[PDB]
Amino acid sequence: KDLGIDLGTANTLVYVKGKGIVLREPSVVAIQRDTKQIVAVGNEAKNMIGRTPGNIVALRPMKADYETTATMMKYYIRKAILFAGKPYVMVCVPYGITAVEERAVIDATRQAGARDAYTIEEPFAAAIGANLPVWEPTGSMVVDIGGGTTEVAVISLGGIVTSQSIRIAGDEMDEAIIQYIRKSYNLMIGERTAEAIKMEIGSAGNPEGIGNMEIRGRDLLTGLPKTIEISAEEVAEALRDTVYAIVESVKNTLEKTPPELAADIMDRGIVLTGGGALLRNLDKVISQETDMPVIVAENPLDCVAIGTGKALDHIDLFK
Numbered sequence: 001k002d003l004g005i006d007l008g009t010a011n012t013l014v015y016v017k018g019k020g021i022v023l024r025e026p027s028v029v030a031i032q033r034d035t036k037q038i039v040a041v042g043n044e045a046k047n048m049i050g051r052t053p054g055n056i057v058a059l060r061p062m063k064a065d066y067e068t069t070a071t072m073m074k075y076y077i078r079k080a081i082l083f084a085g086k087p088y089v090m091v092c093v094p095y096g097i098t099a100v101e102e103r104a105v106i107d108a109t110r111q112a113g114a115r116d117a118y119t120i121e122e123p124f125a126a127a128i129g130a131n132l133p134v135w136e137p138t139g140s141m142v143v144d145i146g147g148g149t150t151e152v153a154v155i156s157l158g159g160i161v162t163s164q165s166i167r168i169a170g171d172e173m174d175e176a177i178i179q180y181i182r183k184s185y186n187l188m189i190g191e192r193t194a195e196a197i198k199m200e201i202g203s204a205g206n207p208e209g210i211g212n213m214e215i216r217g218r219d220l221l222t223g224l225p226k227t228i229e230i231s232a233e234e235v236a237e238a239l240r241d242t243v244y245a246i247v248e249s250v251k252n253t254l255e256k257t258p259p260e261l262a263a264d265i266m267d268r269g270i271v272l273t274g275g276g277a278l279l280r281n282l283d284k285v286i287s288q289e290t291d292m293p294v295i296v297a298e299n300p301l302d303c304v305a306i307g308t309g310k311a312l313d314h315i316d317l318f319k
């Protein structure tokens with residue numbers, strides 16, 4: 001049975017034609033620091049690290065060695081498989097990817113047990129999964145916000161009319177929080193605390209009623225742990241520029257959109273996908289600034305994997 005695979009930065013999802021999302025596993029590998037060989041992938045990497053083997057290092061590559069990709073691919077593909085025969089594999093790839101890179105991915109996926117492999121741009125996959133009328137002769141717009149990248153695209157008739165990718169997304173919001181707290185309180189927090197702040201009280205604006213949070217980090221004068229209280233308002237200000245860039249790429253993409261497709265998107269609205277789109281009120285902020293309806297997709301995390309699975313019903317286009 002044909003598969004679609006979304007090798008996300010943090011999470012990897014495998015769709016099987018008919019079964020749907022069969023596999024949800026961290027995009028992690030475990031490597032022997034002695035031989036530098038991948039000894040586990042995904043949940044096997046997770047458990048191996050959790051038993052503390054020693055001589056093992058945990059990496060997250062998806063944040064592009066050909067052999068890593070091949071190894072990881074071989075694991076997710078065999079794990080997803082009652083075996084019917086070698087699978088046709090659709091692989092989700094970021095928008096900016098180059099042709100030599102696309103052939104690298106295809107060849108590693110073939111190496112990994114695929115009978116043949118095809119690539120799909122992440123925003124195209126997000127649009128299919130979000131159920132936008134991507135095959136109609138009308139304009140649809142998707143904003144997919146991940147951890148590493150924010151990809152915007154206008155779609156019409158099974159293709160990307162125009163598209164823009166920026167390296168400002170989930171991780172960069174965390175990092176803005178870290179640098180705000182460093183500048184405002186001379187406290188240094190790690191990434192786990194920056195992530196928890198963003199999730200628990202983060203917002204793109206209108207932070208009223210979201211709440212305060214107690215956090216711990218390293219005082220930069222003394223080097224000793226310290227506890228402070230942070231407010232939703234401060235996190236809104238800390239994320240201001242991050243949000244402003246996401247807004248600007250949405251505007252820049254409309255500005256390179258043909259006037260009729262721009263007209264259709266303005267009637268139908270912009271659809272936000274990815275985990276980064278769950279930032280409180282990003283939809284309202286983007287809507288306020290573009291003068292356009294914005295909505296968050298129904299299943300914002302599985303959109304891309306579901307779109308990648310659905311694109312198997314149109315293998316012709318990608319082949």
Ligand SMILES: Nc1ncnc2c1ncn2[C@@H]1O[C@H](COP(=O)(O)OP(=O)(O)O)[C@@H](O)[C@H]1O
Pocket residue numbers: 007008009010011145146147148149169170171195198199202273274275276277278279280301
């Ligand atoms: N409730 C939330 N609020 C804000 N950000 C979130 C939330 N849930 C997840 N995220 C962010 O989503 C990102 C991961 O989303 P995902 O779509 O899986 O990324 P990728 O496309 O790279 O796999 C991380 O940056 C994480 O901080």
